Design a protein around this ligand. Sequence first.
Ligand code: NA
Ligand code: NA
Ligand code: NA
Ligand code: NA
Ligand code: NA
Ligand code: NA
Lengths: 433, 433, 433
Amino acid sequence: FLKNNWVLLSTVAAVVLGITTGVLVREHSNLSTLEKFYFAFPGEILMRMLKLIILPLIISSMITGVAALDSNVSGKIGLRAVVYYFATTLIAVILGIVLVVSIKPGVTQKVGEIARTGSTPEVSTVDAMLDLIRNMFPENLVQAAFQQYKTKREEEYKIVGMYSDGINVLGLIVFALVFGLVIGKMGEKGQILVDFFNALSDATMKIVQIIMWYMPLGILFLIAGCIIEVEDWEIFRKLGLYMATVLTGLAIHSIVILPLIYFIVVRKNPFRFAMGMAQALLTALMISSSSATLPVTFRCAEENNQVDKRITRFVLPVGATINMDGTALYEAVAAVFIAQLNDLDLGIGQIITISITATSASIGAAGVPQAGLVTMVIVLSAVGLPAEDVTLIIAVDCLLDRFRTMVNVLGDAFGTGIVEKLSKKELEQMDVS
Amino acid sequence: FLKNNWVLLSTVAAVVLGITTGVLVREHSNLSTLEKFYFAFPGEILMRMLKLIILPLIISSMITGVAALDSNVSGKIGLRAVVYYFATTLIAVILGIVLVVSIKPGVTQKVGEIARTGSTPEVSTVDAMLDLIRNMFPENLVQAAFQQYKTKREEEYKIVGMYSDGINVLGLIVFALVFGLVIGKMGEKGQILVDFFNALSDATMKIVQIIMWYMPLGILFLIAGCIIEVEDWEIFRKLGLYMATVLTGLAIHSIVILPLIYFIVVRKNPFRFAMGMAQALLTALMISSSSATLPVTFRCAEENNQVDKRITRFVLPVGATINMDGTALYEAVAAVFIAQLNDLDLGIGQIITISITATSASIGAAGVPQAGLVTMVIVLSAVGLPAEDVTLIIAVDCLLDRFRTMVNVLGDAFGTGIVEKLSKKELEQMDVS
Amino acid sequence: FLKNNWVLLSTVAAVVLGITTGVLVREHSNLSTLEKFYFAFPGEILMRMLKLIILPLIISSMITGVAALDSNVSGKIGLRAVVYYFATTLIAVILGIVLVVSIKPGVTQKVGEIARTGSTPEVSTVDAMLDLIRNMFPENLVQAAFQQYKTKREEEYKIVGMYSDGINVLGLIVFALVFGLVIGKMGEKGQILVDFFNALSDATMKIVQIIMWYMPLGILFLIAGCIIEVEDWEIFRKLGLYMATVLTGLAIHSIVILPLIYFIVVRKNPFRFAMGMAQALLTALMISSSSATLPVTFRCAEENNQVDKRITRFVLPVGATINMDGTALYEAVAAVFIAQLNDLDLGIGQIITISITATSASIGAAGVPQAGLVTMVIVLSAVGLPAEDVTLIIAVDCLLDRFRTMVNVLGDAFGTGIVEKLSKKELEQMDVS
Ligand code: NA
Ligand code: NA
Ligand code: NA
Ligand code: NA
Ligand code: NA
Ligand code: NA
């Protein structure tokens, strides 16, 4: 049985050992902040090693995937993927809103009882959306590989912009799509670039295979340091009903809505598809990042589920960037819970604008130093609530982010198969002629 | 008639509509600073899309152009282009000085009457020239793609340098020329690099062709927001004679001096050459940037005027970087006008040093966050005037910069044809053997 | 005799003329700080031109060298090189410690008599080593080409990290080694990348050949400005015995230890090997940088000593990065001298930990804005001395750094030949089959 499922067994054992070690250490010892930081060093090393891979993999994969297909086939496949992503995000938002409204978690809990943690950023909604469009079209290609643009209102007001660290994934993907479309039409004139980027993609995948050897040791310390950070369980008991509502929404979505759509589109049992993606699901639940787990999702979807490479290389990065089913559900539930916490009544129009803002904000927001907090503030402003109410939820974000990430990865994995089945005729036509 | 001149007709219609919209909006409505900024969003998007193209196009074009020619042919062509650029800049400076001296605009106008706008930077002349030489030879190739070097005097004085945003075009072009010279001599060993950069150049040109579709909508809002910014026309009336002198100099240069030299060198009617470049001229007059309009100039000069690609790819980027006929004329006229504004008499030696400083400063200065203001301050210091007198002219810089840009582009376009005619024998000899 | 040794003769003449000019200028004239800075402009230009070459040369050379060999041959060659580097650094540290202890320079000199210069940085040992491991694995490939990571302790303490300028050579070399290993195994799939990087390496070497023409003029002003900076010779007389001890250690190492090991391993006379590397030795003694002189060492070792390119391309960059025989000897001598300056007795265990800290700190530290000062502070903290005692030695660092650099380059040059002789069978086996 070994030498075939060694990676999965090692990951499971590392997760179990890390949970046990975190519980034992935190319970039977007292550590300072500096010692707690020093305890999680291998996890940080694994984090930066996985971050090192994102740029070459995304660029080469997008260019190769777009360049392989014809222009007409590419347009159709992209349209189907976009429609699927939008529909799934909207359904997730609707389910979240319905659940949080029905359960009514915030009615009993008082605002004064709940403690406050973290700091609230200052957000302008229009400036945030305009910054999103600006980052769609960067000014410098080299700067976009490690930096992003942001505008702030300053003084009777003037807008001033600056650049800060953090890779601009959206602009890079837009440019990679346009470049692959252009070099596909050149034919014999652009073949050398196609070969260059194909070789680069293969090399990056082999490097990821190398990193997979060290992954378990970093995973152990990552989950252990996640457990050690929480000082007390009283806040967890105080936020029990809200976390239960969020987890119920995520579980219902992942177990019912996506498998039902998959079975309706492609007449196959979706649980074998989910079993194929189990390794990527555990990776997403541990690392808690959708872009860093992309090569694992690539490998799972291609080797286990026998999905076509032409569909996968195109679909997976775009889904990793713009498909946020777990996030939008979270935002909606948190917004309505905060509204119920105060003595504020919610009308039908308020629910509608909350849903629209959550759907657009999650899809648009691909990466920001504080992306979730900014989008949560935007939703709260849309409903009219103060931005300072975000502090109430921050205590359990480190715990819920992992489940949100794994839900996003599951959505992308299901979507790749659905789009592959939808465009079965085009692939046959293209390969025969 | 359509489907052949659609781009030109759309650009003309967009310019007319933008002027009309700007006039109507500013006259029949009152807007705040924030609303004025929000009104020009499509123009800013077009700006950053055009800036995204500069780096790959310049690098690939320079490498391909130098690598195609032989070393001896390259040296001759470069020498002819450099001599033409220097001579045209010197003639422009002389014409400017003669005109501003003859008209005497500053005699009547009092210094106290003219209002003051903007902020005056602090400039050291020797430090500025040394920074120019430093930027000729950058320390890092990756950093030079999006940043530039500057030194300031601080304390009995010590020099401290730092890096700020803004692409270092001069250093990139120097390195690209050296690299293309080196890989041309390698022969069979460097062929793969030649193929790589040829394909990159073709892809970049196709991407520019894509951007040309959205250009008109951005142009409309660019010219409209340019018109809306000016608060009142009283300052325009107060600076009427100075603007008239500058426009007279630019028009005389563009209509007489360049066509005469072109007709003398190559026995052809230069107005058909200008008609071929009309699209690039309108692009430069709208965007007001010489580097961003380079692909349009490439396309016009190659498709319409049937200029050789070997000459064009070498000549156009260098001219875009170091040929500043419109700027030097502006600087000279502004300097002498400021001198006439005060009770200061100008001697022959003062005129000579003004002309020399304007010629060297404009040619050397290719790109700086505030390039024109810094060079104007340098010229004022050379004649001995205070740097605070720059504030008087800033009011109409946004209007005059477009005409200066279009004059620079026209000079480059004429120079490419003149150099092509001068080196007709070398091309034939190289292609036969 | 000319046209064959023109570069060497020009360099020697430039060194002599620069020493003469520096002595005459400083003695018969008085210059301000600004004028002293302006006097060394050509040297600074040569400095930045040599820095421009490091990134492409290192990346292409490492990728090409690793990709050429088989995986098993690569592992053996790397292991032999690593063992040689560690052994030579340890021997250098032991010799330094023995010499400084025997001579006893600090017994007579009082602490109060010695003047203090410069500023002492704040260093945390554990944070420094963790930063070294972090820089081994960077987060962004584009950012690693011009920036480095550093963590500081801030407030009951929290760790905050930031990025500052300075190329991350260690992370780039680790990635280049892994990439070359991966693309070597791909075979026919990775051939285009191999060709690309081979051509890039050849082009970079030709560009270095171009820079060699301007090198002498910059060297003259570099050595002249080095001489002019020192205000008085009294401090040199006060630090005479310490400088004599350091120079004795360096000379003994370079003349006895390395040639003896070379002769023992490969039965050849090592002084002809040293004569071959004379040009690189003078380059290192003038520029005082090990990475900037790497192409000169490449050319000397390949053309003059007939060393195999497969061994050289692999060995020389790693040695330039991690082989610091001169530095560790310096650190040990300085530490023990500072200890003798105070009324502090040194035990055997203290000597052992000093030697271990010097050996590990010099090898690990490849490049930092203040690398020597930080490692000296680390050693002083390891022995328990205050970090403020570093100010005593800074006066002669600009003089001693050149000798340290030339010792490092000599060690790398000897190591390449020793490793080539050790792995003679593998090369024959690989080329026959
Ligand atoms: Na979705
Ligand atoms: Na996703
Ligand atoms: Na000119
Ligand atoms: Na120009
Ligand atoms: Na060593
Ligand atoms: Na070295």
